[PDB]
Design an enzyme around this catalytic site. Structure first.
Site, short mmCIF file in Angstrom:
data_model
loop_
_atom_site.label_atom_id
_atom_site.label_comp_id
_atom_site.label_asym_id
_atom_site.label_seq_id
_atom_site.Cartn_x
_atom_site.Cartn_y
_atom_site.Cartn_z
N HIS A 42 -1.02 -7.41 1.91
CA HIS A 42 -0.75 -5.99 2.02
C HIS A 42 -0.84 -5.50 3.46
O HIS A 42 -0.52 -4.33 3.70
CB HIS A 42 -1.55 -5.15 1.02
N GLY A 101 -11.14 -0.72 6.37
CA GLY A 101 -11.13 -1.78 7.37
C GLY A 101 -11.75 -3.10 6.89
O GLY A 101 -11.69 -4.10 7.60
N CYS A 108 -10.87 -4.86 4.17
CA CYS A 108 -9.96 -5.80 3.53
C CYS A 108 -9.90 -7.11 4.30
O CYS A 108 -9.89 -7.14 5.54
CB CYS A 108 -8.56 -5.23 3.33
#
Ligand SMILES: O=C1C[C@@H](C(=O)Nc2cccc(C3CC3)c2)c2cccnc2N1
Ligand SMILES: O=C1C[C@@H](C(=O)Nc2cccc(C3CC3)c2)c2cccnc2N1
EC number: 3.4.19.12
Lengths: 305, 301
Positions: free
Chosen positions: A41, A143, A145
């Site tokens: 993503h 932040g 991920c």
């Protein structure tokens, strides 16, 4: 003495964390040998996230669209591909700090350590269990991920989790390192909800054994039960079924403490039916289900990495 | 969102842990630059443990009586001295993995990470607080002595605890890295016992602010309190006094959530009175006191 929620030492994973940037999105990647793994993503913008076509977004990107920073060094991306929900960025340098590792997929009930990270920089480590509803109760901000979860079995790091998103209830969803989600989730911005969760019975029993080992014995009683009777009670209280395999796995703790698993099940039955009557167990007023049998034995025996 | 007892990443400390042996006794040491720090009780035998005379035990040792192993490698000890209750062994190699570090002595209520270690090898990492009675509720077995506690604010490791012993109640006592004990303890196996332990009030308040930040308001009420009336009630539940410094320290969390410190104090009073009535706050059915104001701001916002 003492019993604490304990994570594996995180140093071997810390040396693998990098920052991945694509456009105005920055998140974390895992740098092993000459590949950086991160959530696919990273390639999306706001509009894309509603209904992404990942293959179509990816074909439009060049290697130089991905900026990878390891500390203060830029790595050169020389290739890119997707595996399920993870992006794999081939880079021109093998990570000299790559540990012995494997990618493993864990089962609900199993625990692991999470190294929470921001801008490729590790910030915190904590122990999680994969819930029966395939979420984790983590602590993650914007932040985070690409933060990863792992176990250490010897000198080998088993990577089992990469963080992808937060659900509206505030619990967390992610993938194995081969990019397969845990749970019925997808990587897009849409309404998604976890199933109703259950309590991990075998782990509660493990933790009761830990309490006994550490001197906390008030809940023991003269009674025993059978698997079928206990499972009727578990079902009523939204506890996972206990299997014969679970009983086998607790065998060591049963033999060490003199309390058969079904005797401890009789303790747990009474706790569910009557509560704790103002008492605590290992400092908790609720029954703890995020220690496995293996966790308990490891911490009550001093095993080292 | 979410709220977890989170430790610092342990890698910077892992690269400093070594094994120290003297006679038949092995424990952990901390190797920074060219010095290994460890508990001085490594030089005691069975006999020694009630009334060791450390200066007399130490004068009898040579450098080569201390075996220091860093992974697979022996380090050569080229010097030794004692500072309070820690032994400092000068070694012939500076640790190439020495982080930026400092030694800090902490106050009760402060939190830190512990890297539990056995035979110079890391076992696990967990979060602890220094209790008001100067003990910590750790998880430590035989061989864990010399395990350290630390914070890492930025890239700098602040070492604040070294583990020395377990008290009869199952709690743990140790020193700063200058070898001064926390609390009234000594490194002798005489009968000693910790003061009654109390709840760290300022931390409970911090954690209630964390619950509000994470979207939970059920426990608030319409009341306020004076600081003095708060302390009179809280003392009856074995809570530490809240001081004006503590009220000042909670100011930022107050401003972020719109709830005045003394209004949150009123909420806590009611919780002590009522209990939780089957509810939880951030996943706990008890009030949590091992997160500081600083910890809450670091993990939330
Ligand atoms: O765990 C987290 C990370 C991150 C997050 O959840 N991102 C996120 C949410 C929905 C969908 C997606 C992706 C798959 C399409 C990603 C976040 C941002 C802001 C505040 N909290 C958090 N918590
Ligand atoms: O934390 C620990 C370490 C260790 C311990 O407590 N040693 C210890 C006890 C008293 C006094 C001394 C020294 C200063 C004179 C050292 C231990 C041994 C066996 C069982 N549990 C543990 N727990």
């Amino acid at each position: 003495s003492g019993f604490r929620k304990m994570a594996f030492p995180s140093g071997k994973v810390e040396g693998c964390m990098v920052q991945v940037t694509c456009g105005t999105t920055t998140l974390n990647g895992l740098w092993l040998d000459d590949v950086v793994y991160c959530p696919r993503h990273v390639i999306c913008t706001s509009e894309d996230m509603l209904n992404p076509n990942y293959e179509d977004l990816l074909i439009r990107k060049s290697n130089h669209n991905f900026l990878v920073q390891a500390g203060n060094v830029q790595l050169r991306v020389i290739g890119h591909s997707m595996q399920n929900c993870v992006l794999k960025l081939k880079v021109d340098t093998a990570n000299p700090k790559t540990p012995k590792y494997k990618f493993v997929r864990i089962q609900p009930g199993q625990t692991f350590s999470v190294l929470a990270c921001y801008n490729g920089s590790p910030s915190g480590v904590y122990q999680c269990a994969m819930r029966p509803n395939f979420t984790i109760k983590g602590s993650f901000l914007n932040g985070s991920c690409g933060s990863v979860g792992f176990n250490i079995d010897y000198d080998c790091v088993s990577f089992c989790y990469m963080h992808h998103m937060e659900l509206p209830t505030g619990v967390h969803a992610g993938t194995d390192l081969e990019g397969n989600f845990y749970g019925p989730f997808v990587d897009r911005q849409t309404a998604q909800a976890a199933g109703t969760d259950t309590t991990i019975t075998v782990n509660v029993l493990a933790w009761l054994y830990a309490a006994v080992i550490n001197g906390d014995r008030w809940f023991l009683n003269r009674f025993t039960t059978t698997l079928n009777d206990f499972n009727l009670v578990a079902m009523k209280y939204n506890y996972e079924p206990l299997t014969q395999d679970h009983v086998d796995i607790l065998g060591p703790l049963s033999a060490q403490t003199g309390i058969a698993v079904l005797d401890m099940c009789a303790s747990l039955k009474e706790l569910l039916q009557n509560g704790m009557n103002g008492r605590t167990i290992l400092g908790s007023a609720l029954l703890e289900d995020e220690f496995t049998p293996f966790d308990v034995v490891r911490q009550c025996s001093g095993v080292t990495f």
